[PDB]
Design a binder for this molecule. Structure first.
Ligand SMILES: [Cl-]
Ligand SMILES: [Cl-]
Length: 296
């Protein structure tokens, strides 16, 4: 029952756009792969206890986003658009055709954006605590409002996130219900031991589509949500209580609005649901994959 702290996955690397990206790659190579996309400030480590449920039946590919995890650290601005370029190039470098997406946070923005642009290549989407527009600050959860309003500044936000490592030392454990252990925290800390390497951790909250800003991300996210609401693709949406980005009432709304959507209550959860109930997330993804196979 204890949640595993180890990362028993051999490293793989691919060079795209001048830089090495690290990824997990396990499971059979003769089927449709399952592509796992983490968000901020995590890595493929976030999927460590989910992958073992899926690997028996399906290939599992879990990249570390550029600037994160064991991937290289170019001196980028780390805008969403930078992540889009790197992940698009990663997917093509691996020769992926059709996929199943398993996505969270900025990984969900990346995944939904890729799906909208490549709808014929997505067999299913399992999602959790995903990015949607927040049209005003009042739609953002109250207990994270002042935190994220401060993150979204050039002075205080850089001080908190880059100097003081607030995304790793603060937000990450705050948005897991159970206590993270020091071993787990050290795995999350490792990429960001050098303060200068924390740029992506600050740019990400500055890219969130909140209160109309930034306008490019608001438009992009509205576009993929419009696509999602019309798409017949099978969807599996995990949610927790109280949640952060997807509170229970919003999950229930989405169950009804999104086509061919199954919702799964994970129990207690805030944002990093994978750390509170990885076994239910993994076992439910695994159970749901076979019915996606057939092309109708
Ligand atoms: Cl576990
Ligand atoms: Cl963020």
């Amino acid at each position: 029952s204890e949640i595993g702290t180890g990362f028993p996955f051999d490293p793989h690397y691919v060079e795209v756009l001048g830089e090495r990206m690290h990824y997990v790659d396990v499971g059979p190579r003769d089927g449709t792969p399952v592509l796992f996309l983490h968000g901020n400030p995590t890595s493929s480590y976030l999927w460590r206890n989910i992958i073992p449920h899926v690997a028996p039946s399906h290939r599992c590919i879990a990249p570390d986003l550029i600037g994160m995890g064991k991937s290289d650290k170019p001196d980028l601005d780390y805008f969403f658009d930078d992540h889009v370029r790197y992940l698009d190039a990663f997917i093509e470098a691996l020769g992926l055709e059709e996929v199943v997406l398993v996505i969270h946070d900025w990984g969900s923005a990346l995944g939904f954006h890729w799906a909208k642009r490549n709808p014929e290549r997505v067999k299913g989407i399992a999602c959790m605590e995903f990015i949607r527009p927040f049209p005003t600050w009042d739609e953002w959860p109250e207990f994270a409002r002042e935190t994220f309003q401060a993150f979204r500044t050039a002075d205080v936000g850089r001080e908190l996130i880059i100097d003081q490592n607030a995304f790793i030392e603060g937000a990450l454990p705050k948005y897991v219900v159970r206590p993270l252990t020091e071993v787990e925290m050290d795995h999350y800390r490792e990429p960001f031991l050098k303060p200068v390497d924390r740029e992506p951790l600050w740019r990400f909250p500055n890219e969130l589509p909140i209160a109309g800003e930034p306008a490019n991300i608001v438009a992009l996210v509205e576009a993929y949500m419009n696509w999602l609401h019309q798409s017949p693709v099978p969807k599996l949406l995990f949610w927790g209580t109280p949640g952060v980005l997807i509170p229970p009432a919003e999950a229930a709304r989405l169950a009804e609005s999104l086509p061919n959507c199954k919702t799964v209550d994970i129990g207690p959860g805030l944002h990093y649901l994978q750390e509170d109930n990885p076994d239910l997330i993994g076992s439910e993804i695994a159970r749901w994959l076979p019915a996606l196979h057939h092309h109708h």
